[PDB]
Protein backbone atom coordinates (compact mmCIF):
# COMPACT_ATOMS: atom_id res chain seq x y z
CA UNK A 1 0.00 0.00 0.00
CA UNK A 2 2.53 2.56 1.15
CA UNK A 3 5.96 3.37 -0.21
CA UNK A 4 9.06 2.04 1.53
CA UNK A 5 12.70 2.02 0.49
CA UNK A 6 14.05 -1.51 0.10
CA UNK A 7 17.55 -2.80 -0.56
CA UNK A 8 18.24 -5.56 -3.06
CA UNK A 9 19.72 -8.68 -1.49
CA UNK A 10 20.69 -10.34 -4.77
CA UNK A 11 21.27 -9.37 -8.37
CA UNK A 12 18.28 -9.65 -10.68
CA UNK A 13 18.03 -9.32 -14.46
CA UNK A 14 14.81 -8.32 -16.21
CA UNK A 15 13.44 -11.11 -18.35
CA UNK A 16 9.63 -10.78 -18.43
CA UNK A 17 9.60 -7.36 -20.16
CA UNK A 18 7.77 -5.52 -17.35
CA UNK A 19 10.26 -6.32 -14.60
CA UNK A 20 13.14 -4.16 -13.39
CA UNK A 21 16.79 -5.21 -13.24
CA UNK A 22 18.85 -4.37 -10.17
CA UNK A 23 22.08 -5.24 -8.37
CA UNK A 24 22.70 -6.34 -4.80
CA UNK A 25 22.78 -3.27 -2.59
CA UNK A 26 20.67 -1.13 -4.92
CA UNK A 27 17.94 0.90 -3.22
CA UNK A 28 14.41 0.57 -4.57
CA UNK A 29 11.33 2.57 -3.69
CA UNK A 30 8.53 0.00 -3.65
CA UNK A 31 4.76 -0.04 -3.32
CA UNK A 32 4.02 -3.35 -1.65
CA UNK A 33 0.79 -5.18 -2.38
CA UNK A 34 -0.94 -8.24 -0.95
CA UNK A 35 -1.96 -9.96 -4.19
CA UNK A 36 1.41 -11.61 -4.66
CA UNK A 37 5.14 -11.13 -4.59
CA UNK A 38 5.52 -9.01 -7.73
CA UNK A 39 5.70 -5.41 -6.49
CA UNK A 40 5.97 -2.15 -8.44
CA UNK A 41 9.37 -0.58 -7.76
CA UNK A 42 11.48 2.41 -8.77
CA UNK A 43 15.28 2.37 -8.78
CA UNK A 44 16.82 5.48 -7.27
CA UNK A 45 20.00 4.47 -9.10
CA UNK A 46 18.71 4.09 -12.66
CA UNK A 47 15.45 6.03 -12.57
CA UNK A 48 13.62 3.08 -14.07
CA UNK A 49 10.30 1.71 -12.85
CA UNK A 50 8.99 -1.82 -13.09
CA UNK A 51 7.98 -4.93 -11.21
CA UNK A 52 10.37 -6.79 -8.89
CA UNK A 53 10.05 -10.14 -7.07
CA UNK A 54 9.71 -9.32 -3.40
CA UNK A 55 11.83 -12.25 -2.19
CA UNK A 56 14.90 -10.46 -3.68
CA UNK A 57 14.62 -7.40 -1.41
CA UNK A 58 14.22 -6.33 2.21
CA UNK A 59 13.26 -3.04 3.85
CA UNK A 60 16.20 -0.65 4.26
Residue numbers in the entry: 81 to 140
Paper lines:
In this way, in order to stabilize the domain and to be able to crystallize the protein, we introduced a Gln128Arg mutation in the distal loop (v-Src SH3 Q128R; c-Src SH3 R95W-T96I-D117N-L124V-Q128R). The v-Src SH3 Q128R mutant was stable enough to allow biophysical studies and to be crystallized. Even with this stabilizing mutation, the protein was still very prone to aggregation, forming amyloid-like aggregates. The resulting crystals belonged to the monoclinic space group P21, with only one SH3 molecule of the monomer form in the asymmetric unit. The type of β-turn in the RT loop is also different from that found in v-Src SH3 N117D-V124L. In this case, residues Ile96–Asp99 form a type IV β-turn with a hydrogen bond between Ile96 N and the Asp99 side chain. Besides the RT loop mutations, the v-Src SH3 Q128R variant also bears oncogenic mutations in the n-Src and distal loops at Asn117 and Val124. Asn117 interacts with Ser134 in the 310-helix, and a hydrogen bond between Asn112 and Gly81 also reduces the flexibility of the amino-terminal region. In c-Src SH3 the amino-terminal region is usually disordered, but in v-Src SH3 Q128R residues Gly81–Leu89 form an extended β1 strand. In addition to the low solvent content, in v-Src SH3 Q128R a PEG molecule and a sulfate ion facilitate the packing between protein molecules in the crystal.
Cellular Src kinase (c-Src) is one of the most representative members of the Src-family kinases (SFKs), a group of non­receptor tyrosine kinases that mediate responses to extracellular stimuli, phosphorylating a broad range of downstream substrates. Although v-Src shares 95% sequence identity with c-Src, this kinase shows uncontrollable activity that is responsible for the occurrence of sarcoma in chickens. A number of these mutations are located in the SH3 domain, which plays a critical role in enzyme function by facilitating the interaction with partner proteins and providing the formation of the closed inactive conformation of the kinase. Here, the crystal structures of three SH3-domain mutants of v-Src were determined to unveil the effects of these oncogenic mutations in this regulatory domain.
